[PDB]
Each structure stands twice: as structure tokens, then as C-alpha cells.
Design a protein around this ligand. Structure first.
Ligand SMILES: Nc1nc2c(ncn2[C@@H]2O[C@H](COP(=O)(O)OP(=O)(O)CP(=O)(O)O)[C@@H](O)[C@H]2O)c(=O)[nH]1
Ligand code: MET
Ligand SMILES: [Mg+2]
Ligand SMILES: [Mg+2]
Lengths: 267, 110, 470
RNA sequence: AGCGCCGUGGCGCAGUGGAAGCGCGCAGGGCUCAUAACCCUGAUGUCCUCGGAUCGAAACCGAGCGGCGCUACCA
């Protein structure tokens, strides 16, 4: 079962950008299911549908698919929403798609957990969702942290240890992402002996390949030597390759040859 | 379509007409290009490219386009130019293709 | 039942395999025809000259079987800059019964010392009479520096003329005169287009060829029809190479020297750099004998410019890690052949067309580098390689002071500036340093029709020396 | 050879974590006296092939196939 809106309230807020799945259209307008929030329909007026002049209702509505939306007025006694689609800026739709994708990933993960445990999704959200959103501001960022740092599940009471264990199993199995930091060094050496110097620089660079960050010097052509690292934190590899650059410069300068930098370490 | 049709002769020869062959100078040809002033260019089945006038009883009575088999009468005093006399509506053209009055290298089929 | 590879291995073992050279043979007793020298190293360099879109790599692979790379994804079909390399072992059939013309045969590098005679009915083997290295020269109007350097390296020549096209080809005359410049008369003229040529038209074309080569220094150059696509008329080429071309004077008392035409970086990608190789100088030894593990230095070396505009020349010191012939690792070097000397030189130093025509001298010998050279030059009356429509083929002008001219000093392609002009001598100022050891015959080219055009020969008589910084 | 890119339904593209996509084509229908414009509905797949997790794979990944681009012919 799919219920229990991600955000703070089942009913929407004022001027909150929303995220629609259209179901049918009447003469007045479109009554549309809201997927960003739990299940409650919104009314999109015909005069407030299309940026262009209205000519083809079904060409733009696309019954059975998802789209962006904006809320204008809300009813806080029984539940009613006034919605618009014309007034969506060129850039806001991008943040809308990313919010949809992350919220839908979280929804799918927790719906998987609820289906495995046969407990209503609302209870699992009661034990997992919004205390996590209070701690970190986004459940997906906290999920990534729990992938890295397991202190995320500290201070929260789960219904059972099995729930957290199987949630960790699923997140490790599905939310598995290491960034390839790649740099290019041009050896412009003209000295007497460089192959020995190249080997010594090779050893100096490769010895600092840590347990979690293994830096390897790949060879493609004569001048261009590639330096490859798998940066898990993305803030340590650049220093590793800078140290490698210092080492290779130290090795090369004293022997007689020269080395030049072509591509510094970057993501 | 239009209100023009009721002003016409109403000459309804829809049933299959008997196709007309070539007689001592009348020869078959193929429309190659459409020109202006009601004149067409016809490649005749003799290796020549004659200039054929869209002709009386044919001007605004039948409408003809590129790549249409055609019957055209020559002029003995001037061989280069000629006159389109009859048009075959792509069915008896197949029959002539099998009988091969024209070289079969000119293959024009829909 | 036996696989063809097993048959080839059995023939190779029966043929003697590839005997390994002794670590230290008695050098004074060795000759370029000795078994320990001939089995694994060539002794005569034969160059190929011809017009573009004529076919020389095809002729080379018809003769030798070793293909030229024709690389760089844009030089694959049009032209090549670096010279091609090929290796053919010349074999003769000992049996007196088989006719002499087909007794000889050029076989690949991995061929056995005594392979079976492929002629049906003859159960004889083959005797290795000579090993030669076939090198392709670029016959293109702008591609002259590499062509002239190769001609300097070459000891024998092969001119290719297409019968069906125009009889007088000016680029063929260019290459022939360039060869005449550097004291090489062993030229075997070969007609590429004999399949598509008529009975009397071929005779007329041959008569025209004989008419053209009358006043040149080369007089008795053999002329032989060959095929490049049908791959016939190769044995006669081997016979003519053996007979008309004797061994150039090259023995063991002369000082060891090297002339490098091409450089290679030995670094196979994908595999980790832990297992790599140094830098390769592809050079011919026109004089001297080398061994395993020697101490050498490239005399011109690195060229650098100071803030004061002074040209500094750094002799590239290098320890010879190994020397590679066509087939396998050798232990001593036979003079008069192209060898890949794999030394501790940087693969980056051997990356681009850097070590193109540079002289290398072993430790204990001092080739002299020069900035300003006192040269003695001889010109010709008419420019060669110009297609005039029947009006007084281009006339050579006397050289003017302060003119940039391309001088190929044996192997070094330098842009010289004229300081003064005399009746037969001149002063050349070089921004790119160049060396001089004994003679180093020089090819002169001028920029007239937007490209280098050969004008004549020259010899160095003096030079302003510069002392390299160690 | 390595690395970067990719895998139409006919072509150009899109989301790839919830299962066939859009636009341009093509067929049929609609508006119009008639055509174009415009409107409506389809009929086309192995989103390249072999596997792993999974209610789910085409995606996420890997055990490979094929085509493009940089290093560049890498003795
Ligand atoms: N029909 C025919 N083609 C030949 C013959 N000889 C050579 N060719 C053609 O020459 C073409 C290329 O040969 P190739 O040796 O690589 O060219 P090249 O002469 O080295 C170019 P450059 O002169 O600049 O060095 C081949 O495609 C071949 O068809 C021949 O005898 N007959
Ligand atoms: C520069 S040619 C050197 C030949 C050697 N066998 C390598 O390749
Ligand atoms: Mg009527
Ligand atoms: Mg070649």
C-alpha cells in the first residue's frame, strides 16, 4: 500500500511547488493525483493549464504520466487544492525533477520495507522517516550517510531490529554508488637516464596507495602519463596526486630532465 | 471538388475504355519534366527528347504530371516539336509494357 | 594430418633454426659474409625510390615480405614521412640442375638457415648467401629531408618507373641525382607496370629509359621488369642484388659511429608501467662495431636557447641497454645496417620525430659540433623535379646571401642562412646545431616553388666549433 | 591496445531504479465545396547479448558483442 506523504502535513501548504500525476479531465479542468504528497487530488483549471494558447487538451495533459505543478490556494477544513501549470519557470522544473527522483527513491525503499514487513507504511514512516528528516533535512542524504557512517540510526526507536537490518541490506544492495580522479602528467625529459627515474617516481607514487584510496600510474603514451585514484570522499585524492606531483618533480629535477603539468587532479 | 463540376460536360467514361495504339507517326512517349505555358517535355521511345505541346481537347480537360505515359503526334516539317494527343491512365500502360511497343528499360511503376 | 605450423617448425628445426651469436667472437676474423654475422643481421642497405601512386611498399613486400606500416591514420595511403623497414634473407639453391634465375629467393626474417626448396621436383635446401635490409624512401616533392637521409644511409638503390604513365618522370631523376650526389652507383632500375604494357610499347618505354640515363654518372645500372601485385620476378632481383652490388668497404678498425633516422618509445599501453622499456634510437652504423652494454652519447643532443640567444647543445649521454636486429637480440653489431639501439634514453625523448637524422658517438670519441660551417658546394644547371610544358626546364640560380636553405648534412636537416657567397664556397649559419665527423656529404635544397628542391651537392671543409656543456 | 561515448519503432532524441517511450516520419479517420495547415487514433521493439541482487531490470553493477572519438600506430 502507498500512503503517508513525505512532508510535514497530509494537506499541502501555501505556494508549495507540487508534482502531479493526471488521472482524468472534466469540462472545468483536470482533477489530478498528487504524488509529491500523499494521495489528495488537485484541481488544475483549464484557463491555467498551458503556457501556449489552449488548442489540444490531450496533447499536453498526457493522462497517465507525471509532470510539474504549482499550488495556488488550499482548503484546510476538508481538503481542496487549486493548482496551476502555466506559471512554472524554466529553471524550477529541474529542482522539481530532482526532488521527485529523490523522494520517489525514498518512497520505493520504504514501501519495499513495508511490503516485506506487512506493516502499514505510515507506521514505518513514524519510526524512520521524519525524525531522520529532522536530523539531516533529507532522508536520502541520511541514507547515503548510513551507507558511509552508521551513526544515522542512533537515537531512533525502530519497530524491530529486523526492520533496520533489512533496510540496511536493501540500501547497501540498491543505493550502492568512488569518483575517478584522473590527471595527466607530461614528462618532457631530455636527460641522460630517465627510465630509472621514471621507475623511481612510479614506486614513490604507488607506495602511497592507501587501503581505501589506491593511486595507480597508468601508461598510455610517451609524454602523457595518467594518474588514477578512486576518491571515496572526493577531498583526499587531490592531495594524494599533489604529493605524487611533488615526488615526481623532486625525482626528475635532480637527474637533469624536466616534467610539465598538463591536467591537474580533478573529478 | 467544387461547384465547377456541375458546369462541366459530365462526360462519365469511368468504365474501361479501349486503349488506342500508335498510327503512322503517332508514337508513345514519357513525360520527363513539366514546363510552363502549357507545354511538356516528352522522352520518346526512340532515344529522342521532343518538346510536346499540351494540346487541344487536352489542355484543361485532363490533368497530367511527371512520369506519365503518353501518345503524341509528330510533325513532318519540324521533328523537334510535337503535340500530346492522348493520355493513358496507368492501367493500359501496363498492358503496353507487357506487349512492349516501348523499350522495357523505361520502368515506371507506383 | 600435421598442422601447417608443425610443418613450419619441423622445417625450421631441420633448417638449423636461428643460431645464437657468440658473446665475444674473434672480431678481426669476422666478415659481412660470415655465418655468425649473416644468420641474424643484414649487411647491405637497399633503398627504394619512385613516384607517388606508383607502388614501392607493394614492391618491398613482394621482394622481402615485411610490410611497411604506413601509419598515423592520415598517412596510411597518401605518403609516409619516416622510412619503411623490411628484411629479406637471400638464399641460393645449390643444385646445378635447377635453372639459375629461380635458384635465388628472398625469405622472411624468421625463415630457417637452410629451408627446403619450394620448387616442385627439387629436394634441395637453400644456402643463405646474403642478408639485406630493404628501406622505402619517400618520393614526394616536400618529403626530401627523409629521402636524402635515407639515400645517405643506403648502399644500394632500386628505382621504380611506371611504364604506362609518362616516360620522363622528374621525381625519378631527382632521386637518381640525389643518389649520384652521395657516391652510389649500384642502382637496379625496375619497371613496375609490365602486366598492363604492350609488346612494342614496353620496348619503346625501355628505349626511352635508356635514352634518359645517358649523361648521368650511373651508366651500367641493371633494368628488370617486376610485378608488385602478382608478386613475380623476385628471384632475378635477388640475383642482381648479389651480383651487381658488392660489399661496401666497412670493417672493424674504423671508430664506432651511429646515424639515427627514427626514434621509438617502447611503452605498451594498458599494462601497468611497472614493466616498461627505455628509449630506442633507430640508427644505421656506417662505421664501427658495437656490442652489448656500451657507453654512447648523441653529440647534437638537446638544443636549448638562453635568454641571451645562445644555442646550447647537450650531448645526450646513454648506456646501451641492448641492440635489436630484425629477428632477435644480438650481442655484436655488424657495420652497414639499420639497428634499433634500445638504450636508457627517455621514451619521451624518442616520442616524436626528434631523433631524426642525428649522429651518435661512443665514449672515447669526440665528433665535433658546429654553428657556422665553411662549406664547398657544387650546383647543377637545371632544377630537377619540375614539370615544364616544353619550355626550358627550370634554371638554377646562384645562391644569395642571407637566404634560408635546407641542408641535409648526411643526416641532419638544418635550415642554414647564407653569410657570404664565393666562387665555390659559402658560409652557413645554423640555428639548429649540426655535427661533422669525416666528410658527411651534404645535400642542398632551396625553397623556390613553395617546397624544397634539390640544387646540388656540397662538402664541409671547415666549421666554427662549439664546446658542449657536460 | 588502452581510455572516453553509445546501443530506435524508420530517423533525431529520453527517462532510466516502478515497465514500452516522445517528436519527426507512415496508415486510417476528422474539419473544409476541395487541398495544405490543424485535430484524433494506431503499427512498428529483442532501449545491443550473457549473468548478480531484487515483488521489479532496461536501467544499478559485472562477463561480453558491435559501431564512433582522444592517446595515437605505441620496436
Ligand atoms: N595494377 C597494379 N597496381 C600496382 C602495381 N604496383 C603497385 N600498385 C599499386 O600501388 C599502390 C600502393 O603501393 P605503395 O607502395 O604502398 O605506395 P608508395 O609508392 O609507397 C607511395 P610513396 O611514393 O609516396 O612512397 C597499391 O595499391 C597497388 O595497387 C602494379 O604493378 N600493378
Ligand atoms: C629502426 S629499425 C630497427 C629494427 C628492429 N628489429 C626493431 O624494430
Ligand atoms: Mg448536368
Ligand atoms: Mg612506404
Amino acid at each position: 500500500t502507498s500512503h503517508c506523504r513525505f512532508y510535514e502535513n497530509k494537506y499541502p501548504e501555501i505556494d508549495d511547488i507540487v508534482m502531479v500525476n493526471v488521472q482524468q479531465i472534466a469540462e472545468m479542468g483536470a482533477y489530478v493525483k498528487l504524488l509529491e504528497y500523499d494521495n489528495i487530488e488537485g484541481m488544475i483549471l483549464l484557463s491555467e493549464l498551458s503556457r501556449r494558447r489552449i488548442r489540444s487538451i490531450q496533447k499536453l495533459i498526457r493522462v497517465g504520466k507525471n509532470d510539474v505543478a504549482v499550488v495556488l490556494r488550499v482548503d484546510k477544513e476538508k481538503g481542496y487544492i487549486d493548482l496551476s501549470k502555466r506559471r512554472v519557470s524554466s529553471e524550477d522544473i529541474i529542482k522539481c525533477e530532482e526532488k521527485y527522483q529523490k523522494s520517489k527513491t525514498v518512497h520505493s525503499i520504504l514501501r519495499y520495507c513495508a511490503e516485506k514487513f506487512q506493516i502499514p507504511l505510515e507506521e514505518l514512516y513514524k519510526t524512520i522517516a521524519w525524525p531522520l528528516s529532522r536530523k539531516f533535512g533529507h532522508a536520502y542524504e541520511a541514507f547515503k550517510l548510513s551507507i558511509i557512517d552508521e551513526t544515522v540510526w542512533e537515537g531512533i526507536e525502530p519497530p524491530s531490529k529486523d526492520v533496520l537490518d533489512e533496510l540496511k541490506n536493501y540500501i547497501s544492495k540498491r543505493l550502492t554508488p568512488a569518483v575517478k580522479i584522473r590527471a595527466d602528467v607530461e614528462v618532457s625529459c631530455f636527460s641522460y637516464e630517465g627510465i630509472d627515474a621514471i621507475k623511481d617516481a612510479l614506486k614513490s607514487a604507488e607506495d602511497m596507495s592507501t587501503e581505501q584510496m589506491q593511486v595507480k600510474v597508468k601508461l598510455v603514451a610517451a609524454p602523457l602519463y595518467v594518474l588514477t585514484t578512486q576518491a571515496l570522499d572526493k577531498q583526499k585524492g587531490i592531495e594524494q596526486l599533489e604529493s605524487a606531483i611533488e615526488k615526481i618533480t623532486e625525482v626528475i629535477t635532480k637527474y637533469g630532465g624536466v616534467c610539465n603539468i598538463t591536467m591537474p587532479p580533478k573529478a | 471538388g467544387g461547384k465547377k463540376g456541375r458546369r462541366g460536360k459530365n462526360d462519365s467514361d469511368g468504365p474501361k475504355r479501349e486503349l488506342i495504339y500508335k498510327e503512322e507517326g503517332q508514337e508513345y512517349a514519357q513525360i520527363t519534366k513539366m514546363l510552363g505555358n502549357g507545354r511538356v517535355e516528352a522522352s520518346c521511345f526512340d532515344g529522342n527528347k521532343r518538346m510536346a505541346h499540351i494540346r487541344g481537347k487536352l489542355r484543361k480537360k485532363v490533368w497530367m504530371g511527371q512520369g506519365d505515359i503518353i501518345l503524341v503526334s509528330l510533325r513532318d516539317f519540324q521533328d523537334d516539336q510535337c503535340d500530346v494527343v492522348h493520355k493513358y491512365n496507368l492501367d493500359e500502360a501496363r498492358t503496353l509494357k507487357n506487349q512492349g511497343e516501348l523499350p522495357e528499360n523505361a520502368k515506371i511503376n507506383e | 594430418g600435421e598442422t601447417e605450423e608443425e610443418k613450419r617448425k619441423r622445417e625450421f628445426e631441420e633448417g638449423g633454426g636461428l643460431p645464437e651469436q657468440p658473446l665475444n667472437p674473434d672480431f678481426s676474423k669476422l666478415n659481412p659474409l660470415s655465418a655468425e654475422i649473416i644468420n641474424r643481421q643484414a649487411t647491405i642497405n637497399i633503398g627504394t625510390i619512385g613516384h607517388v601512386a606508383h607502388g614501392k611498399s607493394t614492391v618491398v613486400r613482394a621482394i622481402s615480405g615485411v610490410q611497411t606500416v604506413r601509419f598515423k591514420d592520415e598517412l596510411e595511403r597518401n605518403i609516409t614521412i619516416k622510412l619503411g623497414y623490411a628484411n629479406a634473407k637471400i638464399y641460393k639453391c645449390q643444385e646445378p640442375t635447377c635453372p639459375e634465375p629461380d635458384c635465388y629467393r628472398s625469405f622472411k626474417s624468421d625463415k630457417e638457415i637452410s629451408p627446403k626448396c619450394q620448387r616442385p621436383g627439387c629436394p634441395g635446401r637453400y644456402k643463405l648467401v646474403r642478408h639485406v635490409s630493404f628501406v622505402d624512401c619517400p618520393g614526394h616533392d616536400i618529403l626530401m629531408s627523409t629521402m636524402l637521409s635515407g639515400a645517405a644511409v643506403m648502399d644500394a638503390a632500386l628505382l621504380l618507373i611506371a611504364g604506362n604513365e609518362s616516360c620522363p618522370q622528374p621525381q625519378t631523376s631527382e632521386h637518381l641525382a640525389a643518389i649520384e650526389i652521395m657516391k652510389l652507383k649500384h642502382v637496379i632500375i625496375l619497371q613496375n607496370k609490365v602486366d598492363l604494357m604492350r609488346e612494342e610499347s614496353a620496348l619503346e618505354h625501355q628505349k626511352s629509359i635508356l635514352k634518359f640515363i645517358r649523361g648521368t654518372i650511373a651508366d651500367g645500372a641493371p633494368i628488370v621488369p617486376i610485378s608488385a601485385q602478382l608478386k613475380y620476378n623476385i628471384d632475378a632481383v635477388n640475383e642482381f642484388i648479389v651480383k651487381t652490388i658488392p660489399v661496401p668497404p666497412r670493417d672493424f678498425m674504423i671508430s664506432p659511429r651511429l646515424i639515427v633516422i627514427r626514434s621509438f618509445d617502447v611503452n605498451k599501453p594498458g599494462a601497468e608501467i611497472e614493466d616498461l622499456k627505455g628509449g630506442v634510437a633507430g640508427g644505421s652504423i656506417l662505421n664501427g662495431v658495437f656490442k652489448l652494454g656500451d657507453e654512447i652519447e648523441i653529440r647534437p643532443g638537446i638544443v636549448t636557447k638562453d635568454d641571451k640567444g645562445k644555442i646550447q647543445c647537450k650531448p645526450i649521454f646513454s648506456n646501451i641497454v641492448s641492440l635489436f636486429a630484425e629477428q632477435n637480440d644480438l650481442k655484436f653489431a655488424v657495420p652497414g645496417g639499420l639497428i634499433g639501439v634500445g638504450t636508457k634514453v627517455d621514451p619521451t625523448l624518442c616520442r616524436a620525430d626528434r631523433l631524426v637524422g642525428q649522429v651518435v658517438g661512443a665514449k672515447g670519441h669526440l665528433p665535433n659540433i658546429y654553428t657556422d660551417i665553411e662549406i664547398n658546394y657544387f650546383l647543377l644547371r637545371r632544377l630537377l623535379g619540375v614539370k615544364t610544358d616544353g619550355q626550358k626546364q627550370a634554371k638554377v640560380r646562384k645562391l644569395e646571401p642571407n637566404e634560408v636553405l635546407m641542408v641535409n648534412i648526411g643526416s641532419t636537416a638544418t635550415g642554414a642562412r647564407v653569410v657570404a657567397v664565393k666562387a665555390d664556397m659559402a658560409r652557413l649559419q645554423l640555428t639548429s646545431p649540426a655535427c661533422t665527423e669525416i666528410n658527411e656529404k651534404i645535400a642542398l635544397s632551396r625553397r623556390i616553388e613553395k617546397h624544397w628542391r634539390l640544387i646540388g651537392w656540397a662538402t664541409i671543409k671547415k666549421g666554427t666549433t662549439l664546446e658542449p656543456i657536460a
